[PDB]
């Protein structure tokens, strides 16, 4: 198979605040749906709570050391089990949050990263990643507009 991480980062690699995403960027949410639809998505229990409902058209796999509390999604207790629950698929999408990104980054072949030109009070950060290990294979910058209040750049990195 192949493991990919997808995330949106504000300044200083901030990805969250008090278990929430403090911004609204509809173009980035559309990019997220386009790149995760019809794929399995792995997330940690905190991120499941922040989303609050299953993502439709995706197999939702939740990592937690505690028993599952919702039969609409798949609960797993380890990284190995999470990967196995995905089945034989071309690409597995890991959708955070911080503690989960840390664990899957050494396994990942691709990073789908949105860089948001926004300064945000945050407590959760994307993991420190060594830039030499990665090559940029796609980059697309967008200015702010009437629907998206900050400029942003989509990037796909591939492990060298
Ligand atoms: N901007 C973005 O792209 C983005 C993406 C995702 C999330 N976020 C933000 O990230 C923040 C949450 O990230 P987080 O780091 O606090 O928590 P998280 O990584 O979402 O989930 C952490 C929890 O997942 C479970 N877990 C993780 N690894 C496990 C393992 N190997 N085995 C078993 N259980 C495991 C544990 O749950 P138990 O305690 O139940 O064992 C752990 O407490 C929120 O602010 C969210 O909004 C942002
Ligand atoms: N690039 C990126 N941006 C994000 O905002 C993001 N968020 C998470 C975790 N949080 C969330 C929060 C909401 C939705 C969500 O509502 N998505 C719906 C609607 C998409 C839309 O409205 O365009 C979905 O169907 O994917 C997804 C993930 C993980 N990876 C990300 N990756």
Short mmCIF file of C-alpha atoms and ligand atoms in Angstrom, two decimals:
data_model
loop_
_atom_site.label_atom_id
_atom_site.label_comp_id
_atom_site.label_asym_id
_atom_site.label_seq_id
_atom_site.Cartn_x
_atom_site.Cartn_y
_atom_site.Cartn_z
CA UNK A 1 0.00 0.00 0.00
CA UNK A 2 0.97 3.63 0.65
CA UNK A 3 0.38 5.92 3.65
CA UNK A 4 -0.26 9.65 3.18
CA UNK A 5 -0.77 12.44 5.70
CA UNK A 6 -3.11 15.36 5.01
CA UNK A 7 -3.14 18.52 7.14
CA UNK A 8 -3.65 22.28 7.07
CA UNK A 9 -0.97 24.34 8.83
CA UNK A 10 -1.11 27.95 9.95
CA UNK A 11 2.00 29.98 10.86
CA UNK A 12 4.48 28.10 13.08
CA UNK A 13 2.86 24.75 12.07
CA UNK A 14 -0.18 25.40 14.28
CA UNK A 15 -2.99 22.94 13.53
CA UNK A 16 -5.40 23.38 16.44
CA UNK A 17 -6.61 25.33 19.46
CA UNK A 18 -8.56 23.84 22.39
CA UNK A 19 -9.40 20.76 20.28
CA UNK A 20 -10.84 22.90 17.49
CA UNK A 21 -9.79 24.42 14.18
CA UNK A 22 -10.17 28.19 14.73
CA UNK A 23 -10.43 29.14 11.03
CA UNK A 24 -12.87 28.59 8.16
CA UNK A 25 -11.33 28.12 4.70
CA UNK A 26 -13.89 26.53 2.37
CA UNK A 27 -11.42 25.99 -0.50
CA UNK A 28 -9.18 23.96 1.77
CA UNK A 29 -12.11 21.89 3.05
CA UNK A 30 -13.01 21.14 -0.58
CA UNK A 31 -9.41 20.10 -1.24
CA UNK A 32 -9.61 17.82 1.81
CA UNK A 33 -12.80 16.14 0.57
CA UNK A 34 -11.39 15.72 -2.96
CA UNK A 35 -8.26 13.99 -1.69
CA UNK A 36 -9.93 11.77 0.91
CA UNK A 37 -13.23 10.74 -0.74
CA UNK A 38 -13.52 6.98 -1.36
CA UNK A 39 -10.42 6.23 0.77
CA UNK A 40 -9.98 5.04 4.36
CA UNK A 41 -9.16 7.83 6.81
CA UNK A 42 -7.34 7.24 10.11
CA UNK A 43 -7.80 9.76 12.92
CA UNK A 44 -7.10 10.01 16.63
CA UNK A 45 -9.88 10.13 19.21
CA UNK A 46 -9.49 13.87 19.87
CA UNK A 47 -9.91 14.67 16.17
CA UNK A 48 -12.96 12.39 15.97
CA UNK A 49 -14.51 14.42 18.80
CA UNK A 50 -13.71 17.69 17.01
CA UNK A 51 -15.32 16.54 13.75
CA UNK A 52 -18.23 15.03 15.68
CA UNK A 53 -19.71 12.77 12.98
CA UNK A 54 -18.52 10.24 10.39
CA UNK A 55 -17.11 11.60 7.17
CA UNK A 56 -19.40 10.28 4.42
CA UNK A 57 -17.98 8.30 1.53
CA UNK A 58 -14.92 7.30 3.54
CA UNK A 59 -14.10 4.43 5.86
CA UNK A 60 -13.61 6.15 9.23
CA UNK A 61 -11.03 4.44 11.47
CA UNK A 62 -10.54 5.86 14.98
CA UNK A 63 -7.50 5.15 17.14
CA UNK A 64 -8.21 4.97 20.87
CA UNK A 65 -6.97 2.96 23.85
CA UNK A 66 -10.55 2.97 25.18
CA UNK A 67 -13.60 1.03 23.95
CA UNK A 68 -15.52 2.46 21.03
CA UNK A 69 -18.68 4.48 21.65
CA UNK A 70 -20.18 4.58 18.14
CA UNK A 71 -20.80 1.69 15.76
CA UNK A 72 -20.92 3.92 12.67
CA UNK A 73 -17.11 3.92 12.60
CA UNK A 74 -14.29 1.43 13.13
CA UNK A 75 -12.37 1.56 16.41
CA UNK A 76 -8.80 0.23 16.67
CA UNK A 77 -6.27 0.12 19.49
CA UNK A 78 -2.89 0.28 17.72
CA UNK A 79 -1.24 1.65 14.60
CA UNK A 80 -0.79 -1.85 13.18
CA UNK A 81 -4.48 -2.61 13.70
CA UNK A 82 -5.45 0.73 12.11
CA UNK A 83 -3.45 -0.05 8.98
CA UNK A 84 -4.90 -3.57 8.76
CA UNK A 85 -8.47 -2.29 9.13
CA UNK A 86 -7.98 -0.26 5.93
CA UNK A 87 -7.89 -3.39 3.77
CA UNK A 88 -5.97 -3.68 0.52
CA UNK A 89 -6.25 -0.15 -0.87
CA UNK A 90 -3.80 1.94 -2.91
CA UNK A 91 -3.62 4.83 -0.47
CA UNK A 92 -4.36 5.27 3.24
CA UNK A 93 -5.09 8.85 4.39
CA UNK A 94 -4.03 9.84 7.94
CA UNK A 95 -6.01 12.92 8.98
CA UNK A 96 -4.49 13.74 12.42
CA UNK A 97 -4.31 15.11 14.89
CA UNK A 98 -0.92 15.97 16.37
CA UNK A 99 -0.18 12.78 18.27
CA UNK A 100 -1.37 10.63 15.36
CA UNK A 101 0.61 12.61 12.76
CA UNK A 102 3.74 12.06 14.87
CA UNK A 103 3.29 8.29 14.73
CA UNK A 104 2.56 7.97 11.00
CA UNK A 105 5.09 10.49 9.65
CA UNK A 106 8.00 7.94 9.57
CA UNK A 107 5.74 5.56 7.65
CA UNK A 108 4.43 8.09 5.16
CA UNK A 109 5.32 8.38 1.47
CA UNK A 110 3.26 11.51 0.73
CA UNK A 111 2.23 14.67 2.58
CA UNK A 112 -0.72 16.77 1.40
CA UNK A 113 -0.10 20.09 3.15
CA UNK A 114 -2.06 23.33 3.04
CA UNK A 115 -0.08 26.34 4.26
CA UNK A 116 -2.42 29.05 5.54
CA UNK A 117 -1.17 32.64 5.76
CA UNK A 118 -2.76 33.15 9.16
CA UNK A 119 -1.40 33.65 12.69
CA UNK A 120 -3.43 31.69 15.22
CA UNK A 121 -3.19 31.02 18.93
CA UNK A 122 -2.57 27.28 19.00
CA UNK A 123 -1.71 24.39 21.28
CA UNK A 124 -1.32 21.58 18.72
CA UNK A 125 1.42 21.58 16.08
CA UNK A 126 2.24 19.52 13.03
CA UNK A 127 5.34 17.40 13.70
CA UNK A 128 8.79 18.71 12.89
CA UNK A 129 9.72 17.17 9.53
CA UNK A 130 13.23 17.14 8.09
CA UNK A 131 12.98 19.01 4.75
CA UNK A 132 15.75 17.00 3.04
CA UNK A 133 13.64 13.85 3.13
CA UNK A 134 10.89 15.39 0.99
CA UNK A 135 10.51 16.58 -2.58
CA UNK A 136 7.76 18.92 -3.75
CA UNK A 137 5.74 17.41 -6.61
CA UNK A 138 2.86 19.90 -6.67
CA UNK A 139 2.36 23.46 -5.45
CA UNK A 140 -0.52 25.88 -6.03
CA UNK A 141 -0.82 29.31 -4.39
CA UNK A 142 -4.11 31.18 -4.00
CA UNK A 143 -4.79 34.73 -2.90
CA UNK A 144 -7.59 35.45 -0.44
CA UNK A 145 -11.01 36.13 -2.00
CA UNK A 146 -14.64 36.75 -0.99
CA UNK A 147 -15.03 33.12 0.17
CA UNK A 148 -11.56 32.50 1.68
CA UNK A 149 -10.33 35.16 4.08
CA UNK A 150 -6.63 34.17 4.01
CA UNK A 151 -4.22 33.30 1.24
CA UNK A 152 -3.15 29.66 1.15
CA UNK A 153 -0.97 27.26 -0.79
CA UNK A 154 -1.61 23.58 -1.54
CA UNK A 155 1.52 21.42 -1.64
CA UNK A 156 2.09 17.70 -2.17
CA UNK A 157 5.40 16.37 -0.86
CA UNK A 158 6.82 12.95 -1.64
CA UNK A 159 9.47 11.12 0.37
CA UNK A 160 12.74 11.15 -1.59
N1 LIG B 1 -5.37 21.52 10.86
C1 LIG B 1 -5.42 20.15 10.65
O1 LIG B 1 -5.09 19.72 9.54
C2 LIG B 1 -5.86 19.28 11.71
C3 LIG B 1 -6.07 17.84 11.41
C4 LIG B 1 -6.54 17.04 12.55
C5 LIG B 1 -6.71 17.59 13.76
N2 LIG B 1 -6.43 18.95 13.98
C6 LIG B 1 -6.45 19.46 15.37
O2 LIG B 1 -5.61 18.63 16.12
C7 LIG B 1 -6.05 18.68 17.51
C8 LIG B 1 -6.11 17.27 18.14
O3 LIG B 1 -4.90 16.68 17.90
P1 LIG B 1 -4.35 15.76 19.27
O4 LIG B 1 -2.89 15.62 19.07
O5 LIG B 1 -4.83 16.58 20.45
O6 LIG B 1 -5.15 14.37 19.46
P2 LIG B 1 -5.33 13.23 18.23
O7 LIG B 1 -3.98 12.92 17.68
O8 LIG B 1 -6.45 13.63 17.32
O9 LIG B 1 -5.94 11.97 19.06
C9 LIG B 1 -5.14 11.70 20.20
C10 LIG B 1 -5.80 10.42 20.83
O10 LIG B 1 -5.89 9.37 19.86
C11 LIG B 1 -5.67 8.13 20.55
N3 LIG B 1 -4.45 7.49 20.05
C12 LIG B 1 -3.40 8.05 19.33
N4 LIG B 1 -2.45 7.16 19.00
C13 LIG B 1 -2.93 5.95 19.53
C14 LIG B 1 -2.40 4.65 19.52
N5 LIG B 1 -1.20 4.39 18.91
N6 LIG B 1 -3.07 3.62 20.11
C15 LIG B 1 -4.27 3.96 20.70
N7 LIG B 1 -4.89 5.14 20.80
C16 LIG B 1 -4.18 6.14 20.19
C17 LIG B 1 -5.64 8.44 22.08
O11 LIG B 1 -6.93 8.42 22.42
P3 LIG B 1 -7.32 7.64 24.03
O12 LIG B 1 -6.94 8.82 24.89
O13 LIG B 1 -8.77 7.47 23.71
O14 LIG B 1 -6.43 6.40 24.09
C18 LIG B 1 -5.03 9.86 22.04
O15 LIG B 1 -5.40 10.54 23.21
C19 LIG B 1 -7.44 19.38 17.50
O16 LIG B 1 -7.22 20.73 17.79
C20 LIG B 1 -7.84 19.26 16.02
O17 LIG B 1 -8.67 20.32 15.63
C21 LIG B 1 -6.04 19.78 12.96
N1 LIG B 2 -6.12 20.21 4.36
C1 LIG B 2 -6.82 19.89 5.48
N2 LIG B 2 -7.70 20.81 5.97
C2 LIG B 2 -8.44 20.61 7.07
O1 LIG B 2 -9.25 21.48 7.48
C3 LIG B 2 -8.30 19.31 7.76
N3 LIG B 2 -9.02 19.01 8.86
C4 LIG B 2 -8.84 17.80 9.43
C5 LIG B 2 -9.63 17.41 10.66
N4 LIG B 2 -10.89 18.17 10.76
C6 LIG B 2 -11.91 18.18 9.86
C7 LIG B 2 -12.97 19.05 10.09
C8 LIG B 2 -14.04 19.12 9.20
C9 LIG B 2 -14.07 18.32 8.06
C10 LIG B 2 -15.23 18.40 7.10
O2 LIG B 2 -16.29 18.89 7.46
N5 LIG B 2 -15.10 17.93 5.86
C11 LIG B 2 -16.29 17.56 5.11
C12 LIG B 2 -16.85 18.76 4.36
C13 LIG B 2 -15.88 19.26 3.30
C14 LIG B 2 -16.39 20.56 2.71
O3 LIG B 2 -17.34 21.16 3.27
O4 LIG B 2 -15.87 21.01 1.68
C15 LIG B 2 -15.96 16.48 4.13
O5 LIG B 2 -16.89 15.91 3.53
O6 LIG B 2 -14.77 16.20 3.93
C16 LIG B 2 -13.00 17.45 7.82
C17 LIG B 2 -11.92 17.37 8.72
C18 LIG B 2 -7.91 16.90 8.90
N6 LIG B 2 -7.18 17.18 7.80
C19 LIG B 2 -7.33 18.36 7.18
N7 LIG B 2 -6.63 18.71 6.08
#
